[PDB]
Amino acid sequence: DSFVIRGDEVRQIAPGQTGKIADYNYKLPDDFTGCVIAWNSNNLDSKVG
Amino acid sequence: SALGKLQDVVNQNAQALNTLVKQLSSNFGAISSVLNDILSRLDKVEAEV
């Protein structure tokens, strides 16, 4: 599952949490079996404009 | 005092029933003895504990 979010919304990706991300667009089940991987891509995706 | 044995048997049965009933109000280390109170509280992942 590949997606880009805000740096403060990383805590909402964890299963069984709150927030707009975990309740409106992307929610993980309580029996999620896997790992969550995230890294910064400021110099890759973000633009000065 | 003639039917003391029967009275003691009945009293023991009644006391066992009353103790089994009253053992519901205990917390056993939880936050409250009422399940509806725990449901109207911290999320399911933390309420299962």
Q: What is the DSSP string of chain A?
A: ------GGGGGGTSTT--SHIIIII----TT--S-------TTTT----
Beta strands in B1-49 (DSSP E): none
CA distance B44 to B49: 9
Burial of A8 (0-12, 13-18, 19+ CB in 10 A): exposed
Report the phi/psi class of residue A16: left, alpha or beta, with left for phi > 0 and alpha for psi in -120 to 50: left
- The amino acid present at B26, given as its one-letter code, is S
Tokens representing residue A28 in the block: 């993980």
CA distance A38 to A49: 24
Interface of chain A toward chain B, CB-CB under 8 angstroms: 15-18, 30
Question: What residues contact residue B39 under an 8 Å CB cut-off, 6+ apart?
Answer: B47
Experimental method: cryo-EM
CA distance B34 to B15: 23
| CB spacing of A30 vs B45 below 8 angstroms | yes
Cβ-contact A11, A17 below 8 angstroms: yes
Cβ-contact B1, B7 below 8 angstroms: no
Query: CA nearest B47 in A: which residue?
Result: A16
